[PDB]
Amino acid sequence: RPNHTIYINNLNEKIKKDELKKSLHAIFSRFGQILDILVKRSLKMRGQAFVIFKEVSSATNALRSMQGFPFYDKPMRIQYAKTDSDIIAKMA
RNA sequence: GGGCACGCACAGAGCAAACCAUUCGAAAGAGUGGGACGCAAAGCCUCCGGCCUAAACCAUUGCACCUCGGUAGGUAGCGGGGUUACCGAUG
Ligand SMILES: Nc1nc2c(ncn2[C@@H]2O[C@@H]3COP(=O)(O)O[C@H]4[C@@H](O)[C@H](n5cnc6c(N)ncnc65)O[C@@H]4COP(=O)(O)O[C@H]3[C@H]2O)c(=O)[nH]1
Ligand SMILES: [Mg+2]
Structure with a gap:
């Protein structure tokens, strides 16, 4: 069931918090x-992350394209x- | 670690459709070389089903209009089955 938030895992646990946030952003934007x-x-x-997208359509295209992306x-x-x-x- | 399954990957590898050249073959087809449409066994095997060939050999002078002899050879990249094998997000 689609959502504004994508759940990502199998991430590298050796990447510092801020750097991971930044790169995650930089290619999910x-x-x-x-x-x-x-x-x-x-x-x-x-090893895991939530990217919260403003509208759902954006989360679906994200999941679709960069699934399995190393x-x-x-x-x-x-x-x-x-x-x-x-x-x-909280918006609603 | 092994052995069973699984294919959304990830990480190394492999195969080769069509076309052309050439060889084998009656033919359908196959081999080799170039070449890539795709393939998780598109590695290997006709045991079963399907489909393709049907020349030569044997049977057959037979009244059809859905098609229909044996025999033989193909297609494993048409399936089912059998058998060998890499990776790991997985029952
Ligand atoms: N090592 C391995 N990897 C697998 C296996 N099954 C799935 N995968 C992975 O899923 C991908 C796609 O599987 P597929 O069955 O749909 O498509 C496969 C299949 O269609 C084909 N393919 C590639 N190598 C093949 C091969 N050796 N045998 C048969 N088909 C093959 O191309 C796709 C493989 O590309 P790939 O290696 O990048 O990715 C696989 C692979 O990463 C598998 O049984 N072994
Ligand atoms: Mg070749």
Whole structure:
């Protein structure tokens, strides 16, 4: 089920938080405007990220194009987030 | 680690449609060389089904109008099955 937020994993856990945020942005921006990028590095949130897109269409094109895309020597696995981000919920 | 499955990849490799040249073949087809349409077994095997050939050999003087003898050879890149094998996001 499509969503404003794409959930990304199989990411490289050795990339610092800010750098990962930046690059994630820098190549997910082409698909539309990015509300936020929530990244981290704790134990269960390790190696993974949420890119929050302003409208859904942008998240679908993103997932479609860069599924399996190898990123910092690892192939990104992209699904839709199961839940709306607090940002998006908060707008409504 | 092995062995079973799986193909959305990832990371190394492989094969080769059409066309042309050439060889084998009655033919359909096959080999070799060039060459890439695609292929997760498009590696290998006719056991089953399909489709293609049908010259020579044997049977057959037979009244059809849906087609219909044996025999033989093909297609594994038409399936099913059998058998060998790489990768790992996975039951
Ligand atoms: N090593 C491996 N990789 C696999 C396998 N199955 C799937 N994959 C991966 O999924 C890709 C696509 O599989 P496919 O069955 O749809 O298309 C395959 C298939 O159609 C074909 N192909 C490539 N190598 C092949 C081969 N050796 N045998 C048969 N088909 C092959 O081209 C695609 C393979 O490209 P690929 O190597 O970049 O990517 C595979 C590969 O990364 C597999 O059984 N082994
Ligand atoms: Mg060749």
